[PDB]
Amino acid sequence: KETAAAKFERQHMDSSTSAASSSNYCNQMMKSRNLTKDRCKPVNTFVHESLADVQAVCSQKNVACKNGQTNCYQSYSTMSITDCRETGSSKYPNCAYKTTQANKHIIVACEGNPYVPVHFDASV
């Protein structure tokens, strides 16, 4: 089965673009990354940076996750991210999303060896 680390890359990494270029970015990516296969995932954040810079966050600012876990880390610097949020018209299998580009610090949960991101906690 796909590992948590690989799942993180599939669900959140988009090193191939610097930012979302059109309102259709979320619709296209959510579908292409298989995030809408069984149901419309309500929200998702893509990160437009190299995997290495995102993996590096696991050795940056240690902070408590939203759920209280203490294996979360916050990026020292801001990162280019695209927030995808379901629209009022979204209906499975035709999941629809609102695309929002921003530059924020990200918070990820890390685990394993190598110690890498396995969950996107929040952007601040």
Q: Is 71 annotated as a binding residue?
A: no
Q: Is 7 annotated as a binding residue?
A: yes
Q: Tell me 114's DSSP state.
A: T
- Domain limits at 101? 1-124
Active-site positions?
A: 12, 119
Residue 1 and residue 83: Cα distance in Å, rounded? 27
For 66, residues 6+ apart whose C-beta sits below 8 A from its C-beta are 107, 121, 122
Experimentally determined by: X-ray
Residue 4 and residue 109: Cα distance in Å, rounded? 11
CATH of the domain at 116: 3.10.130.10
| In the chain, beta strands by DSSP E | 43-47, 61-63, 72-74, 79-86, 97-104, 106-111, 116-123
Q: Tell me, in Å, the resolution of the deposited structure.
A: 1.7
Cross-sheet strand order for the sheet of 61-63: 61-63, 72-74, 106-111, 116-123
Q: Is 41 annotated as a binding residue?
A: yes
Tokens representing residue 4 in the block: 């948590």
Into how many domains does the chain fold? 1
